[PDB]
Symmetry: D2
Subunit: 237 residues, 4 copies
């Protein structure tokens, strides 16, 4: 199926599938069942920022999500991505709502990838940065309910004309170009991403989350992957 590495901003505790019982940031290596989570004090209606960093020297995938107020949640996991992901991938943002819902608004998203082979100055790099998203954002593949342009933002999941989030929605945006994430003869593979999000819900509890992910290039939304599956996984195995 798809090969997924993701950092999830999981807004809803599905302890049924191994979520801790609080909103959490998590590192997901080919399963929605995070290898590692940290409690995340999600702030309904605040703008937050997630930073995801990997270096292939230290082989440690780290992520922080924070709110200006100051609250901040951190998670790291040792993983050799050489062993997990295909050589070439796509990188994206995914979000979902289920029975409970939230806006999954991306205000900005940036990504830098570096790939060095041994041979002096031999870095390849990709960087993109979106601070504004237009109606027709041709460097993004939008999947599912993802739209761009409304207030210059990427709405990952359905929002009504009056800003009201809809449930059972899933959507993703992938950067258009494949990303070379490792090679046979790589000295340093390394990447980082940042995105700023606004998760707002009128419900008793927001759900389900936003994920930064890295997939096989031809990745698409697994069917049924709204709600707790986060646009990322066909099931909770």
């Amino acid at each position: 199926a798809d090969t997924i590495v993701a950092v999830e901003l999981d807004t809803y505790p599905n302890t049924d599938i191994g979520d801790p019982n609080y909103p959490h940031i998590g590192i997901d290596i080919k399963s929605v069942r995070s290898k590692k989570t940290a409690k995340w004090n999600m702030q309904n209606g605040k703008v937050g920022t997630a930073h995801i960093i990997y270096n292939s020297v230290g082989k440690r995938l780290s992520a922080v999500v924070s709110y200006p107020n100051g609250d901040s949640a951190t998670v790291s996991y040792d993983v050799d991505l050489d062993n997990v992901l295909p050589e070439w991938v796509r990188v994206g943002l995914s979000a979902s709502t289920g029975l409970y819902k939230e806006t999954n608004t991306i205000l900005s998203w940036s990504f830098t990838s570096k790939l060095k082979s041994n041979s002096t100055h031999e870095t390849n790099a990709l960087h993109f940065m979106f601070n504004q998203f237009s109606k027709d954002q041709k460097d993004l593949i939008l999947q599912g309910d993802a739209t761009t342009g409304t207030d210059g933002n990427l709405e990952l999941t359905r929002v009504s004309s009056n800003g009201s989030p809809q449930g059972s929605s899933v959507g993703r945006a992938l950067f258009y170009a494949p990303v070379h994430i490792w090679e046979s003869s790589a000295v340093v593979a390394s990447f980082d991403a940042t995105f700023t999000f606004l998760i707002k819900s009128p419900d008793s509890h927001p759900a389900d989350g936003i994920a930064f992910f890295i997939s096989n290039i031809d990745s698409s939304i697994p069917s049924g992957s709204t709600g707790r599956l986060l646009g990322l996984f066909p099931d909770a195995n």
Copy 2:
């Protein structure tokens, strides 16, 4: 018909179609007959560097080609590219051989695009850098004879395994993601590109050159644009 903006490193004078009677650098606005040229002393078998720069504020497209010994040619052209290019483009390198030939070897290629909309820190950006090209370079669209991987280089045109370039070859490499080159709502759009090239004619009678170009996203090698048309234009109008 494609819409092409190019900077050509034109190694062969086709005075026939308006070339000056020497190797030149030129800025091509929708025609192989450059709007502006400068004399260029192509150094056969040496690694050269071309830098292309444009910002939407000064509305000047500028290019330099230089070699390590310090010899360099420069050309600029005042042009408002919103009047020329679609809002969304691909960027690429193109090369051809005709009756005469040369290696059109790209050793590295990088590009930066920035687009700022009205709205305060509101920059979108694309950057990529290839200092090494792999046999399977999925973030490049390879067209015609273009191959990558051969010594970690991009050979835009056909070169036999002994290192000998072939006549009537065209090839191009376009970056995979479309590039947002302008918008209505744009305070600043700007881009710059650099590539290093090894043009070598074992005759020391080189043809036809290399171009950095910007095209409509669906651009392909026009029919019969080997030789002097540099993989860019259907004819010499």
Copy 3:
């Protein structure tokens, strides 16, 4: 004395010294008497952004100042900076108030410098970006009334504890490291800066302006250079 190249955001028309009779953006080459101005619809109390770009291929210094609302003023001037500035310089922000006053608040400031010599990949570069300024900003030399830290901003000129700007104030912030702006054997010298500013005045008219400047390294505020002189020039010659 000092060698100054500046882009001025001149908020006050001193037609006595050659200002056009409206707020204006201007390019100043060793004189406060701009070589080139454009009318600038200054918006008292709005956050604006100025972008300054130079490439040494095109030898055209350009600047745009804009407000999110959408208003935007542009100016360019052909100048070989090789001939104006010393090889090594400092880059800074300057502002002043006089009889009339305004806050000269910098919210952010970034700068990129590139210097290539002929010799393939041989780029030197400096980039810095400040989105927040702390109390003790050791990579900035603060001159005159310039302070950092109050709300994470750089206040270039005196503001009272309640946010009220003071007249006859001058201040500057220079990036700490000297910048190599040209060399003998430079293929491309090129730089750009961005800053976002908030100019607010309670007076009948704001004054006097903010300038992005490039100076000799040992540059200091010319005495008496409050008001129309903008922290930049000892006189209006």
Copy 4:
């Protein structure tokens, strides 16, 4: 006493002071006795590349040294640098020779620091890149025997004009601007550095190595830290 964080490319085993009995790479936290080393097969007379990376999220300092043939050594150390370094530092390269010698030639050096405070797009950044060092390199502080300009390189230690390195030489180059490496209010601090070096011993008995270091801003070469102390430490404690 200076506060030093270093990554050493240590070419000479002083088993005396805890070095392993082979050339190694190591992470030095306030002591020349590395907290972590990895075997390093220094290739005499070849141009190597060292990459150093740290982010404050994963809290792992990682380094690789490699040569073009693909041989590479890697070392990581879990460290929270806020516990080690002052908030404001300088970064630099250091080298020494002692009884044994080697060229400590730096062909290029680059560094990127990012510091994000609580506050939403709130990143401060410093980047510099030297691919060519000039005789008068005003953005470097040169200490001890360090000179620049000689072949566009930085010779950290004394080399005679025939190309022959000298014993008991120390030198360093610190980037001129202080670097904000952490703050209380910091969501993410991270940095990475790269330098390429040519260590050559015309005996093929090299000493003593090169280090990338981060120090208190006022750091100078400690007394008698030629040889094994690498210009970094006053003694071998």
